[PDB]
Amino acid sequence: IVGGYTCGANTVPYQVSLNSGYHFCGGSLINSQWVVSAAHCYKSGIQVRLGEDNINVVEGNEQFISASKSIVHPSYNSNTLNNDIMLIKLKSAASLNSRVASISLPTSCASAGTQCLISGWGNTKSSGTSYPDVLKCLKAPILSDSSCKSAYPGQITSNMFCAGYLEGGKDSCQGDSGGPVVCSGKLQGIVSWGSGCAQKNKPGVYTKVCNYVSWIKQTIASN
Ligand SMILES: Cc1cc(CN)c(C)o1
Ligand SMILES: [Ca+2]
């Protein structure tokens, strides 16, 4: 997250870190045994880390649970990043509490102008490289489909939306991949892609979660 703020320990209780020897992606806990992330975060050997603030220090509220299975969306295209969504099942159910909690799926799509919270352990620099240890947060509005398409000619599908600031300065970045965009207590987006970070007229692009609720529910119900 570039141009954000330090969230505060366990203030974003649905935020997970995906770890394969190191943090490589964010995710969102949607029930006691399932995480939603980006399909571009797919790899084998995933451990889900919940209750994290400082990802380099065991602070006492963590639960570390290995993934038993991952399900990449059947229509995910890695070139275009269309349908950039994946489900991860935990080998055992997380113990839910005030610091480890699920986030509700949307019942309807959020509109341009809706204020959301984006979070992650990604790069905090727009030019250089600096990775924070503690979770960073950014309040950002959803941008109109028209401005999103104008920002990225030929690249925005019906499964994507832009959020952030056309002036730049405040954005998601590398390492935030797969993490949450939460608006009014609903998971509306997944950190997906962009062009650099916090650059003028290049806002973050997010997977449009409301399009996938039926798939998520049916997949969970049979797996
Ligand atoms: C994970 C990620 C988010 C964004 C949006 N600035 C980029 C380039 O990479
Ligand atoms: Ca920790």
Per-domain boundaries in the chain: 1-12+103-210, 13-102+211-222
The binding site for Ca(2+) comprises: 52, 54, 57, 62
Set 17, 28, 40, 176: catalytic member? 40
Candidate from 136, 148, 181, 191 with most ligand 1 atoms within 8 A of CB, to mutate: 191
> Whose alpha carbon is nearest atom 3 of ligand 1?
173
Whole-number Å distance between alpha carbons of 124 and 198? 10
Whole-number Å distance between alpha carbons of 50 and 26? 10
Pocket flag, ligand 1, residue 88 (CB < 6 Å)? no
Residues 6+ apart with CB under 8 A from 1: 118, 119, 120, 122, 124, 132, 136, 137, 138, 171, 172, 173, 176
Active site residue 133: no
Out of 2.40.50.100, 1.10.3720.10, 2.30.30.40, 2.40.10.10, the CATH code matching 13-102+211-222 is: 2.40.10.10
CB 177 within 8 A of CB 40: yes
Q: What does residue 221 show for φ and ψ, rounded to 5 degrees?
A: -65, -20
**190 strand-pairing partners:** 180, 207
Pocket flag, ligand 1, residue 193 (CB < 6 Å)? yes
Which CATH superfamily, name and number, covers 1-12+103-210?
Answer: Trypsin-like serine proteases (2.40.10.10)
Whole-number Å distance between alpha carbons of 149 and 160? 10
In eight-state DSSP terms, residue 200 is T
Set 84, 102, 176, 192: catalytic member? 84
Residues 6+ apart with CB under 8 A from 195: 152, 202
Report CA(223)–ligand 1 centroid distance (Å). 30
Report CA(33)–ligand 1 centroid distance (Å). 27
Structure tokens, 164: 């952030």
**Residue 180 CA from chain centroid, whole number:** 3
Active site residue 176: no
Of the bound ligands, which one is closest to the alpha carbon of residue 57?
2
- Which resolution in angstroms does this entry have? 1.7
Same CATH fold assignment for domains 1-12+103-210 and 13-102+211-222: yes
**59 strand-pairing partners:** none
How far CA 96 is from CA of 58, 131, 159, 181, in Å, comes to 18, 28, 30, 21
| Helical residues (DSSP H) of the chain, grouped into ranges | 145-151, 213-221
Whole-number Å distance between alpha carbons of 24 and 177? 8
H helix count then E strand count, the chain? 2, 13
* Number of C-beta neighbours around residue 44 at 10 A: 7
Question: Terminus-to-terminus CA distance in the chain, angstroms?
Answer: 33
Q: Smallest Cα–Cα separation from 101: which of 28, 46, 49?
A: 28
Sign of CA dihedral 214, 89, 176, 15: positive
How far CA 107 is from CA of 20, 85, 110, 143, 218, in Å, comes to 33, 18, 10, 20, 15
Pocket flag, ligand 1, residue 190 (CB < 6 Å)? no
